[PDB]
Amino acid sequence: GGPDRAQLAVWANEAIIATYTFDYKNYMQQQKEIAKYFSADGWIAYSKALNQSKLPEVVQKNAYFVNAVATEPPKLITLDPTHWQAIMPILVVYKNPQYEQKQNLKVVLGFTVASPGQGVRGFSVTSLQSTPISPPCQC
Structure with missing residues (x-):
């Protein structure tokens, strides 16, 4: 009964990773595709934050390829x-x-x-x- 935890956890990971997967070359077309994961209000907020952080300008000046990976599985809560x-x-x-x-x-x-x-x-x-954090540890 109810949604699948695996379905929600897989999608949340895909959405987060898609958002942090772009490069200086095709930035605009990639963002247009990333936007499909968001609600109209969700995108308006995110894009406001992203442009104000001036990350698009950094990516251009440094000719960067941005990629991301989970360091831990997501935690899910139902609101x-x-x-x-x-x-x-x-x-x-x-x-x-x-x-x-x-x-x-x-x-x-x-x-x-x-x-x-x-x-x-x-x-x-x-x-x-997203808030910056410390890296994780291992042994």
Whole structure:
């Protein structure tokens, strides 16, 4: 009964990773595709934050290729029958042939059942918040 935890966890990971997968060359077309994962209001907020961070300008000046990977599986919470939140730590790499830049982020993803013709595979990002964190450890 209810949604599939695996379906929600897989989508939340895909949505977070898609958002942090772009490069200086095709940036605009890639962002247009990333936008499909979001709700209209969700995108307006995210794009506002992304442009204000001036990350698009950094990516251009440094000819970067941005990629990301989860450092831990996402944590899911149900806010209402159609609204969920995923908390997932990721590693983002800003790479070019000369050098690299790495960053660990805590991504808080608010998401819901997509509205007609919108979202990706039936879900829409309502909010994406990322705060820088410490890297994880191992033994």
